[PDB]
Amino acid sequence: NPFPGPQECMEMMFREFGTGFEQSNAFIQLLTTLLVPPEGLNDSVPFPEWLGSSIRTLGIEPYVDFVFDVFANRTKDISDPSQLRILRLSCLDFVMVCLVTFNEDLIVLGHESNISIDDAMAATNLATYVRLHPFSRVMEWLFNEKVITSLINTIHQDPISLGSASPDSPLVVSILRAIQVMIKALELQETYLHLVRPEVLRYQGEAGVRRKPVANAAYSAFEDGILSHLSLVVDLGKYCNLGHAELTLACLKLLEKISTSSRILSAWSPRNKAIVQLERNGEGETISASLSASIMATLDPALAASGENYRVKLAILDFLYACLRATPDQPTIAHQLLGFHCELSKLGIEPKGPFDMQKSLFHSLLNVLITLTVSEEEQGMRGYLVTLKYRVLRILQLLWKSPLSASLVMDELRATNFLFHMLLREVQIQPQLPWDGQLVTGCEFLLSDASLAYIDYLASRAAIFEYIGKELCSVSQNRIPSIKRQIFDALNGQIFVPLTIPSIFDFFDFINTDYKWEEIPSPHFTYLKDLDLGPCIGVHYDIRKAQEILALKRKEYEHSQLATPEFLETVELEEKVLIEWLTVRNRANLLLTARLNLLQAWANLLLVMIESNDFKSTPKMAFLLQALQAILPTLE
């Protein structure tokens, strides 16, 4: 009643506060600040449940509705680009503050066990939370064409502006916020369409609510509204040459999620559109060149896990892995970025191209891999180097297994002596060399993160052995002794360019039963002994399945009213021991399967070597006896 009905006065005041930019931005900031709870950034949604109960209003929805209507329609009356950028940034921040304040796991567990197991008392609380929280309205607005059009217009800008702009420029911050909102929407679209739409529809059907739809029924998902924009990927790729770590990581994650989808790649390749869009003015070439220049940039030894360069490298590697693992038979953008001529159900190399001159992304990866040393002195056997090489080897294996990109890759590898570089980069493992300053025999080893690096190193050795065996089989079937001599010399322990290297029998040091990975010390467990891991269990024992059971048991014991305060610490320490027991069992299973895979790879390599061997046997009798001596204790 601002001094005329309230439904009219409120909209009149909102429209009055919409004229201009200063007052609009100030109101948006005020609303964003008010939406923050007093405890800071989970229940008790930050607003009174009786907000607007007197008048026939939907609560706090009108505010978000007006904000979205403004951001969608009145963005053309702003001449000053700075004001428009500030308004878009404020709207994106408001949307993010509204989305981040939504419970996902809570609603999932509710819809799962509340009505099916728990009573119907708390159901009303979750219902009111889902009905009053503005997340549903934001998601509904996200399916509008105006919103995505404004977003892609804001993200589509000239490169000169971003180049001459400052890292703290509002344009970069707005683009980052928009990418984050898009990521959150792509993550929560399924949860919404599953546990919001039906409940809201049922509530609207039962009770009396007057709401105006703002979503498009045709857009069954968020990808339907964005699959019509081809310049988005081009802009995301061009924005990688700016140097901004956060923006680069966001763009890489967005491209990875896009390549991971299915409808987008079904619409693109039902000839194709992306390959021709990225080959308009040589965008792929410059993108590959920028990626190569980036991965070649060194890292900061002190800021191992904080070096933005290493983070960008890992993001690019994850993107390539996700793009190659998805739909390997049909080519993708990864093949074009590597320097291949992506043709319909066929690949090829062009003359004088970047991949022909051995200057491309794949060759850059090969170089940075062969010029990488993991053997250190101060710590020795670092972890992030191991992770990097493991990712590189996974990408190489994904490229090799694909028969569409196997022959050319093997040719390019054998034409540069990659196996020789790998062997020269090999390092022997012993129980004395610690992992990141920590010894293996220590009990904390199974609890520390060194297990991941150990599994990665085992997988790397297995992949190297498999590649060596495949190359040996190829050279044998090709009936050419020009390379067989060098292969045997490398296996004999000599190199003629003589440089010596440890033989294959030297690397047979990963089979050791002294650690007793199978045996586990079982504590007394005077209580909770009957709690098994039935619902916990692909050997993967979930911890929540036992956490809920032990919590229910503790609640029952407390309700029994028999020395509940004293014996609580016993149950607490038993749970703290059981969680580490489960983690140790999982790590032991992982180590066991890794050792099994490595042993299988080594056995296959040895079989391929023994079978395809025309060299005399009397000289190799020494190696035969050595292998027999080495396997004797293993069999025993």
Partner: peptide, 9 residues
Amino acid sequence: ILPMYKLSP
């Protein structure tokens, strides 16, 4: 063609 890929330590 192989400026640095050579095995010349």
